[PDB]
Design a protein around this motif. Structure first.
Motif, PDB file in Angstrom:
ATOM      1  N   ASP A 139      50.799  34.946  50.598  1.00 54.83           N
ATOM      2  CA  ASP A 139      51.198  35.041  49.581  1.00 54.83           C
ATOM      3  C   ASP A 139      50.676  36.194  48.749  1.00 54.83           C
ATOM      4  O   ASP A 139      49.817  37.000  49.470  1.00 54.83           O
ATOM      5  N   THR A 140      51.181  36.589  47.627  1.00 53.50           N
ATOM      6  CA  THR A 140      50.564  37.696  47.106  1.00 53.50           C
ATOM      7  C   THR A 140      49.350  37.287  46.061  1.00 53.50           C
ATOM      8  O   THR A 140      49.519  36.373  45.230  1.00 53.50           O
ATOM      9  N   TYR A 141      48.214  37.833  46.399  1.00 53.45           N
ATOM     10  CA  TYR A 141      46.935  37.791  45.609  1.00 53.45           C
ATOM     11  C   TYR A 141      46.784  39.088  44.975  1.00 53.45           C
ATOM     12  O   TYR A 141      46.957  40.077  45.450  1.00 53.45           O
ATOM     13  N   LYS A 142      46.051  39.060  43.727  1.00 46.77           N
ATOM     14  CA  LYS A 142      45.863  40.099  42.936  1.00 46.77           C
ATOM     15  C   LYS A 142      44.439  40.490  42.733  1.00 46.77           C
ATOM     16  O   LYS A 142      43.588  39.086  42.478  1.00 46.77           O
ATOM     17  N   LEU A 143      43.679  41.610  42.567  1.00 45.42           N
ATOM     18  CA  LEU A 143      42.540  41.881  42.301  1.00 45.42           C
ATOM     19  C   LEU A 143      42.310  42.820  40.919  1.00 45.42           C
ATOM     20  O   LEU A 143      43.341  43.819  40.639  1.00 45.42           O
ATOM     21  N   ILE A 144      41.829  42.118  39.737  1.00 41.02           N
ATOM     22  CA  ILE A 144      41.669  43.034  38.469  1.00 41.02           C
ATOM     23  C   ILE A 144      40.439  43.526  38.496  1.00 41.02           C
ATOM     24  O   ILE A 144      39.308  43.011  38.614  1.00 41.02           O
ATOM     25  N   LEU A 145      40.400  45.055  38.263  1.00 39.47           N
ATOM     26  CA  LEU A 145      39.236  45.957  38.425  1.00 39.47           C
ATOM     27  C   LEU A 145      38.842  46.452  37.115  1.00 39.47           C
ATOM     28  O   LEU A 145      39.494  47.068  36.714  1.00 39.47           O
ATOM     29  N   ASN A 146      37.884  45.878  36.398  1.00 36.80           N
ATOM     30  CA  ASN A 146      37.188  46.352  35.150  1.00 36.80           C
ATOM     31  C   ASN A 146      35.841  47.329  35.700  1.00 36.80           C
ATOM     32  O   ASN A 146      34.831  46.578  35.417  1.00 36.80           O
ATOM     33  N   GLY A 147      35.990  48.138  36.234  1.00 32.68           N
ATOM     34  CA  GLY A 147      34.948  49.249  36.599  1.00 32.68           C
ATOM     35  C   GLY A 147      34.535  50.166  35.465  1.00 32.68           C
ATOM     36  O   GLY A 147      35.141  50.360  34.653  1.00 32.68           O
ATOM     37  N   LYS A 148      33.275  50.751  35.451  1.00 31.54           N
ATOM     38  CA  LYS A 148      32.663  51.507  34.403  1.00 31.54           C
ATOM     39  C   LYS A 148      33.770  52.806  34.506  1.00 31.54           C
ATOM     40  O   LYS A 148      33.956  53.374  33.464  1.00 31.54           O
ATOM     41  N   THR A 149      34.139  53.343  35.770  1.00 33.10           N
ATOM     42  CA  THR A 149      35.098  54.668  35.793  1.00 33.10           C
ATOM     43  C   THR A 149      36.315  53.981  36.546  1.00 33.10           C
ATOM     44  O   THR A 149      37.441  54.859  36.353  1.00 33.10           O
ATOM     45  N   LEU A 150      36.656  53.043  37.339  1.00 38.27           N
ATOM     46  CA  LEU A 150      37.790  52.693  37.998  1.00 38.27           C
ATOM     47  C   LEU A 150      38.379  51.159  37.173  1.00 38.27           C
ATOM     48  O   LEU A 150      37.712  50.282  37.311  1.00 38.27           O
ATOM     49  N   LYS A 151      39.515  51.413  36.582  1.00 44.52           N
ATOM     50  CA  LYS A 151      40.211  50.419  36.162  1.00 44.52           C
ATOM     51  C   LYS A 151      41.487  50.325  36.782  1.00 44.52           C
ATOM     52  O   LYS A 151      42.105  51.128  36.722  1.00 44.52           O
ATOM     53  N   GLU A 183      44.521  47.399  38.934  1.00 42.30           N
ATOM     54  CA  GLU A 183      44.766  46.250  39.548  1.00 42.30           C
ATOM     55  C   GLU A 183      45.410  46.474  40.969  1.00 42.30           C
ATOM     56  O   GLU A 183      45.991  47.657  41.213  1.00 42.30           O
ATOM     57  N   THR A 184      45.246  45.899  41.846  1.00 45.49           N
ATOM     58  CA  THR A 184      45.776  45.886  43.115  1.00 45.49           C
ATOM     59  C   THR A 184      45.985  44.483  43.702  1.00 45.49           C
ATOM     60  O   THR A 184      45.677  43.507  43.220  1.00 45.49           O
ATOM     61  N   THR A 185      47.220  44.543  44.659  1.00 44.01           N
ATOM     62  CA  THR A 185      47.490  43.338  45.401  1.00 44.01           C
ATOM     63  C   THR A 185      47.508  43.165  46.848  1.00 44.01           C
ATOM     64  O   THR A 185      47.507  44.248  47.607  1.00 44.01           O
ATOM     65  N   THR A 186      47.343  42.094  47.455  1.00 49.08           N
ATOM     66  CA  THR A 186      47.245  42.076  48.637  1.00 49.08           C
ATOM     67  C   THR A 186      48.192  40.708  49.322  1.00 49.08           C
ATOM     68  O   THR A 186      48.464  39.802  48.487  1.00 49.08           O
ATOM     69  N   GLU A 187      48.949  40.739  50.673  1.00 47.84           N
ATOM     70  CA  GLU A 187      49.658  39.776  51.040  1.00 47.84           C
ATOM     71  C   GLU A 187      48.656  39.140  51.948  1.00 47.84           C
ATOM     72  O   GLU A 187      48.151  39.689  52.921  1.00 47.84           O
ATOM     73  N   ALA A 188      48.360  37.748  51.831  1.00 49.65           N
ATOM     74  CA  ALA A 188      47.497  37.210  52.491  1.00 49.65           C
ATOM     75  C   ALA A 188      47.641  35.557  52.728  1.00 49.65           C
ATOM     76  O   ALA A 188      48.330  35.096  51.861  1.00 49.65           O
TER      77      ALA A 188
END
Length: 56
Positions: A1-13, A15-20
């Motif tokens: 399935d598709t899992y998502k990562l939401i990044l709220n970084g100081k400099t890097l904002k 999203e990214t996804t992976t099939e896992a």
């Protein structure tokens, strides 16, 4: 399935996804992605939406 990562970084904002096969594979893709991108933060996982959030 598709899992998502939401990044709220100081400099890097973004999203990214992976099939896992499962959330506990996706975490060990995303916890590589975050530390490739030098993101150090508090993590949460929401099983309902298959979404991880990292907040710096």
């Amino acid at each position: 399935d598709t899992y998502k990562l939401i990044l709220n970084g100081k400099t890097l904002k973004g999203e990214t996804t992976t099939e896992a096969v499962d959330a506990a594979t996706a975490e060990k893709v995303f916890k590589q992605y975050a530390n490739d991108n030098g993101v150090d933060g508090e993590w949460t996982y929401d099983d309902a939406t298959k979404t991880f959030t990292v907040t710096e």
